[PDB]
Structure formats: structure tokens, C-alpha cells
């Protein structure tokens, strides 16, 4: 199965240029946690801000044009991507915009990172529609001395 694995702030806001407008260590620790040894689907634009491969993972790249690191193994189309993963139980869809935007259809599952924080940003999430989804988890954390904001994490299977 696919899965879409994001991070929302408040307006199913995802980013302001090329970033997060937040800095929260505990989620990325659950990111990883999340991802692990599992194919990731990313963008030319997403891996842009990565900058390296991911460790413990098979490093999908989408890009129209041509590869640009060895390390990486890139893609031209959805089908392509796909493709590159294989034989896999999961495959972790890690963003950004347009590529959340194509996958969410195929998507079965989402692990979600709601932040309690309202700020502007120019990428939103596709717009899931409730009916569809069934949550089965949630987990709350308040703010801390690193993770400026409360947020909470979510799993929610395509019912
Ligand atoms: N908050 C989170 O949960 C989370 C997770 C990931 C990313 N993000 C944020 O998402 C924002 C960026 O996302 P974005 O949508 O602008 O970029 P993106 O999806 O990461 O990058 C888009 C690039 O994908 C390529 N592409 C997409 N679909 C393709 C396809 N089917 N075939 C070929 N190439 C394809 C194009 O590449 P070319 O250059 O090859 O034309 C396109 O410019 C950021 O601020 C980032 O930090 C947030
Ligand atoms: C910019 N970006 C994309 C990113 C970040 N947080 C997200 N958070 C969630 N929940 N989902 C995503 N798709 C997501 N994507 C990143 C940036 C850094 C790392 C990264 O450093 N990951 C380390 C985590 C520890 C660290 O940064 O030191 C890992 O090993 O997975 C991952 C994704």
C-alpha cells in the first residue's frame, strides 16, 4: 500500500518557501520512526531541503529532468516511482505539494503531525474529505523546550 505521511500547521498548512514554518525535533523523530526501512516518494523540491539521502530508506526522486546526486535513485512519473519501490507491504509518500496532490487518491492511510500553530505558508494539504478516512490513533504532546508548539499525531485509514 501507499501512505502520505505529513505535517500540518493550522489551514492544512504545509510550508512557505521551500520550508516549514517550524521547527519541531519530535517530529521528524516520528517521521523517521514512521519511515524506517520503506521506500520514500519526495520531489525535486522536497529533496531539495533534505539535501542528502535518508538514511535506512530507498530514496525516490521526482523529477522531470535529470538526476543530480548518484546517491538517489530519480523518476519521471508517477507510474515510474511506482515502479522504483517493489515488492513492499508500504510506500511512504514524504511530499511536498503537487506530489501529496497525486498520490492522496492511491493513498490508504495517513499519518498525520497536527501543530498547533496558525501561520501563513504557501503550500496546503490535499484536501482529504472525512467520510473517506476512519482515525485510529491519536496522540497528543504539549509544547516543550524544543518543540516550540503542541501537536498531535494521527493515523487515519481510508475507510
Ligand atoms: N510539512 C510537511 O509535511 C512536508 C513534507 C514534504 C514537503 N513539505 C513542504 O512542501 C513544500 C514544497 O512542495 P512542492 O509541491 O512545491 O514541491 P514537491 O512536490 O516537493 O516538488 C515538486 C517537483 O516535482 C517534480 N514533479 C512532481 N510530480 C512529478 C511527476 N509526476 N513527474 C515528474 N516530475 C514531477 C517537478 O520537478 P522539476 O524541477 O523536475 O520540474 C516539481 O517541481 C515545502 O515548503 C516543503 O518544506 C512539507
Ligand atoms: C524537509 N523534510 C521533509 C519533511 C520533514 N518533516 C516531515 N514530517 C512529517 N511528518 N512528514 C513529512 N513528510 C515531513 N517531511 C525533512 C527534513 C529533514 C529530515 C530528516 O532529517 N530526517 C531525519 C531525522 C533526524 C534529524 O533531522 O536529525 C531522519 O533520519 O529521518 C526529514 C524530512
Not at 505535517?7 to 510550508?15: C, E, T, Y
Not at 525516490?60 to 519521471?76: A, E
Not at 492522496?104 to 467520510?131: C, R
Request: proline share 6%; net charge negative.
Amino acid at each position: 500500500m501507499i501512505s502520505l505521511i505529513a505535517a500540518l500547521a493550522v489551514d492544512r498548512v504545509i510550508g512557505m518557501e521551500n520550508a516549514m514554518p517550524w521547527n519541531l525535533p519530535a517530529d521528524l523523530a516520528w517521521f523517521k520512526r514512521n519511515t524506517l526501512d520503506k521506500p520514500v516518494i519526495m520531489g525535486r523540491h522536497t529533496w531539495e531541503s533534505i539535501g542528502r539521502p535518508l538514511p535506512g530508506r530507498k530514496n525516490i526522486i521526482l523529477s522531470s529532468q535529470p538526476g543530480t546526486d548518484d546517491r538517489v535513485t530519480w523518476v519521471k512519473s508517477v507510474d515510474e516511482a511506482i515502479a522504483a519501490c517493489g515488492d513492499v507491504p508500504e510506500i511512504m509518500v514524504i511530499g511536498g505539494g503537487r506530489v501529496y496532490e497525486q498520490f492522496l487518491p492511491k493513498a490508504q492511510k495517513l499519518y498525520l503531525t497536527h501543530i498547533d500553530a496558525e501561520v501563513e505558508g504557501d503550500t496546503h494539504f490535499p484536501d482529504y474529505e472525512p467520510d473517506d478516512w476512519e482515525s485510529v490513533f491519536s496522540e497528543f504532546h504539549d509544547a516543550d523546550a524544543q518543540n516550540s508548539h503542541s501537536y498531535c499525531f494521527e493515523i487515519l485509514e481510508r475507510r
